[PDB]
Amino acid sequence: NNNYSKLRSMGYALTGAVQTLAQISDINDQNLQQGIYLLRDHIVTLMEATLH
Amino acid sequence: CFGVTFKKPLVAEEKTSLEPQLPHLQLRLPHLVGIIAKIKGIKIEVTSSGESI
Ligand SMILES: *[C@@H]1O[C@H](CO)[C@@H](O[C@@H]2O[C@H](CO)[C@@H](O)[C@H](O)[C@H]2NC(C)=O)[C@H](O)[C@H]1NC(C)=O
């Protein structure tokens, strides 16, 4: 119950949240980019044949 | 000569060439390959967040 101790403990928790939030943000952004790339590739493949 | 009139023989063109006229549809989708090429190179840039921090 030291005045510094229950502050050090909260300092421990106040950084894993930031780290995990960054990780989830990166995962979401990468998934969105991959989906967009797959969609554009399929669209181009479909688009060539009708022109020909 | 006498009562009958005489006319010169007519020369004839030896060959003819046939070049029929064709309708012009003027479709616009063809010769648009450049737009497809532009679609190919979208190049979305994403920078990892948290690696720097
Ligand atoms: C074949 O392509 C040529 C070139 O695109 C067409 O010629 C054009 O025809 C238009 C319409 O009469 C004119 O305004 C252009 O000046 C022409 N360009 C040239 C370079 O001649 C032609 O019409 C096409 N053939 C068919 C059957 O569509």
Side-chain angles (χ1 to χ4, degrees), chain B residues 1-17 19-53:
Chain B
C1 296
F2 292 164
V4 176
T5 61
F6 297 150
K7 307 198 178 189
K8 57 170 165 61
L10 76 164
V11 75
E13 306 292 346
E14 183 178 1
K15 305 173 312 172
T16 186
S17 186
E19 175 53 24
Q21 308 293 347
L22 299 175
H24 308 250
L25 267 54
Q26 298 171 356
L27 303 188
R28 307 192 316 217
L29 175 59
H31 59 271
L32 264 190
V33 180
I35 294 187
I36 301 182
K38 291 185 179 304
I39 292 175
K40 288 184 176 180
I42 293 304
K43 274 315 298 173
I44 299 184
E45 161 175 34
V46 174
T47 62
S48 172
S49 66
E51 193 281 328
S52 57
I53 73 155

Side-chain angles (χ1 to χ4, degrees), chain A residues 23-47:
Chain A
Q23 288 173 193
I24 305 176
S25 164
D26 292 354
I27 292 298
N28 287 344
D29 291 343
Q30 280 170 24
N31 288 355
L32 290 192
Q33 189 205 49
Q34 293 307 314
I36 295 174
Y37 278 7
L38 185 66
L39 185 54
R40 75 169 172 81
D41 272 354
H42 279 341
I43 281 163
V44 162
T45 295
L46 262 189
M47 271 315 327

